[PDB]
Amino acid sequence: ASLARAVERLKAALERPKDEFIRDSAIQRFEFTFELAWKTLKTFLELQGLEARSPRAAIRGAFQVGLLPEDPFWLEMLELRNLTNHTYDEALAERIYAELPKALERFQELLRRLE
Amino acid sequence: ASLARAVERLKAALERPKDEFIRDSAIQRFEFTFELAWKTLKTFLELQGLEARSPRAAIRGAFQVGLLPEDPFWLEMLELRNLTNHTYDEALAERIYAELPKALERFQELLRRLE
Numbered sequence A, B: 001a002s003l004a005r006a007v008e009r010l011k012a013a014l015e016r017p018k019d020e021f022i023r024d025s026a027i028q029r030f031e032f033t034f035e036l037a038w039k040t041l042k043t044f045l046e047l048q049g050l051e052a053r054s055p056r057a058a059i060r061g062a063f064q065v066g067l068l069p070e071d072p073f074w075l076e077m078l079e080l081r082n083l084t085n086h087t088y089d090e091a092l093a094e095r096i097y098a099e100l101p102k103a104l105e106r107f108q109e110l111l112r113r114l115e
Helices: A003-015 A020-047 A055-064 A073-081 A090-097 A100-113 B003-015 B020-048 B055-064 B073-081 B090-113
Strands: none
Touching: A003 A020, A003 A100, A020 A055, A020 A073, A020 A090, A020 A100, A020 B020, A055 A073, A073 A100, B003 B020, B003 B090, B020 B055, B020 B073, B020 B090, B055 B073, B073 B090
16 A cells, blocks of 8 residues: 555546546545555554544544644545535536645645654 | 436436546436435435435435345445545445446336336
8 A cells, every 4th residue: 555656547547638537546646645645644643642533533543743743724625525425416526636735835735744 | 416317417427438537427317316315215214104214224224125126235335425535546436436327226226126
């Protein structure tokens, strides 16, 4: 499970010229990237004593323990991520794809900070 | 939200010639088309005067009331449905995709029977 590669796959879909297929595939890739992301934070945090038993906690953890800089947007992403399974609603699909480009910026940031 | 419509969205992605983006989008259209499917059984069961709290309970209930015929593949789908988030692993995505054409036959069947 490589984070650097999951990002590469998300970026990929995000550069293509949008249509419903590339859209959904972007959303799809957004989810598994987020899974590897928070697990990353987890492992990192646990390494130094702290404990994260859930994504939000891993976000909150990284925020205090330095790592990621105070960005209320991460919590915003977490919220979108819970909707991916309700995208049978095409408007919600669009509403989500609209924020992926930013979400990508955050992931690219985490990759950097993890040195 | 229409199940019949969500099924049509899956069919579409399945007819198009394959590649990564289409692959991933078919997975994502499965992630939600399945969510509507169990929420549709739940509703049906409720109207039947029964109770179903979870996806499995709903599928088991479907078999009991005689809506759907005995088919162990429905549980395999649920097992697949819960792996979408572990798609950062491409060997898995391919494993899921391969089973989608079968899953579509079953969704179309459910739709046909709710008639």
